[PDB]
From a paper:
The chitinase Chit42 from T. harzianum (orthologous to Ech42) plays an important role in the fungus anti-phytopathogens activity. Chitinase Chit42 from Trichoderma harzianum hydrolyses chitin oligomers with a minimal of three N-acetyl-d-glucosamine (GlcNAc) units. Chitinases from GH18 are retaining enzymes, which means that the β-anomeric configuration found in the substrate is retained in the product, showing an unusual substrate-assisted catalytic mechanism where the acid protonating the glycosidic bond (to be hydrolysed) is a conserved glutamate residue (included in the DXXDXDE sequence), and the nucleophile is the oxygen of the N-acetyl group (of GlcNAc) on the subsite − 1 sugar. All chitinases described in yeast and fungi are included in the family GH18.
We have modeled a chitooligosaccharide within the active site channel by structural superimposition of the reported complex of this substrate with the Serratia marcescens ChiA-D313A mutant onto the coordinates of Chit42 here presented. Although ChiA and Chit42 sequences are only 26% similar, the corresponding residues located at the active site are rather conserved. Therefore, the distorted conformation of the substrate at the cleavage point observed for ChiA fits well within the Chit42 active site groove. First of all, the substrate is tightly recognized at subsites − 4 to + 2 by a net of hydrogen links to several Chit42 residues. Therefore, there are at least 6 substrate-binding subsites in this protein. According to our complex model, Glu316 is hydrogen linked to O3 of the sugar at subsite − 2, but seems also able to link to a free amine group by a slight switch of its side-chain, therefore compensating the loss of the hydrogen bond to Trp378 and contributing to stabilized a deacetylated sugar at this subsite − 2. According to our model, Arg52 is also involved in allocating the sugar at this subsite; therefore, its flexible chain provides additional plasticity to the sugar type occupying this binding subsite. A last interesting feature is the fact that the side-chain of Trp131, making subsite + 1, presents rather weak electron density in our solved free enzyme crystal, revealing a marked disorder.
Numbering used by the authors: 35 to 423
Write the structure that this text describes.
Amino acid sequence: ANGYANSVYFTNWGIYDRNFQPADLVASDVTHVIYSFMNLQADGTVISGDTYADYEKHYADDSWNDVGTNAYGCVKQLFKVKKANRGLKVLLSIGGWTWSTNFPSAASTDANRKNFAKTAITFMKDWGFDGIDIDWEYPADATQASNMILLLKEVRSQLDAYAAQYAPGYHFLLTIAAPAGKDNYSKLRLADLGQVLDYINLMAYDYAGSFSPLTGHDANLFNNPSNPNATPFNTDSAVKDYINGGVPANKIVLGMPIYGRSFQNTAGIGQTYNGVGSGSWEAGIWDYKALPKAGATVQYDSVAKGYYSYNSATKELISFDTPDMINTKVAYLKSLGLGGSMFWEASADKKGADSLIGTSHRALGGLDTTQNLLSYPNSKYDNIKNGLN
Ligand SMILES: [Zn+2]
Ligand SMILES: [Zn+2]
Ligand SMILES: [Zn+2]
Ligand SMILES: [Zn+2]
Ligand SMILES: [Zn+2]
Ligand SMILES: [Zn+2]
Ligand SMILES: [Zn+2]
């Protein structure tokens, strides 16, 4: 709004094995935290996928003897973050890869869309959040694409009505996560999305993995015509298609991965491979903070603009973003007038100089300082209603 976005996904399941709590966020680097994910029913009902993580878990200073009805979990922890970081906005994210199967039904009728908006906004206002992010992966045809716009317009309308009563003058944010593959984005109502939304977070990653016939760059900027098997996708073609399709450049936030995708038993990038192997927490996927691994050296495809660790002894290649990659992507996004950087996801980042999110903050320079909201007079949680005072 008044500067670049530097946003990050915070997953509610990251509080378990990953042990990444909201207090662990380096909040000074972040303009938006995208709190992920709420689930969705076929009738449009938005629901918590984890009530413990969301609002029940007691942290060390969460009393067992508070009066009233009170929110704990990540909700209270994030409200603390918001108080201490007035330029940091928290968005309620709905859907994702696993929980998008009910979006078509949820967007399909006026009643369902109204129920979606009301239930989503109820969580947002109860939890003390600044907006809503919709991650429908992915609208499959024209009917769904049109219905997505109808859904977003309903949420925008209801947000504005909510603010007029309970946060006058505050602009609640409405965003999406958006596909970088043309097979998906060619179905979207791009011009409508450009008009109705505050931000489009481009998922400029997951270009290559276990689903690909050869090793590929996961999040490269450009095609490599001298080694095109290494670049099954590229970000630049997607960015230009979004802008030319009617999404204003300043609303596009360039997603970047804080993880690598591994390829086993291979000679290099663009080449044959056997499996993806193990991961940090799930097969084929490695936290950036574990990379590069011991005995691996980072190489760079300067045409594609993509790095990868290589270990000459084990034949493991891992495609991942480095601090230098982030500097290059920030130079790129600034050159096209984009709105900033987005990251999936917070728990996997390094701390200090090698933080991808911190690298992005420094390369962007002037971050969005638009003030968050701390007034929730209609929250059902007394502690949120009282601003934790
Ligand atoms: Zn476990
Ligand atoms: Zn309790
Ligand atoms: Zn996703
Ligand atoms: Zn507004
Ligand atoms: Zn707006
Ligand atoms: Zn995951
Ligand atoms: Zn700064």
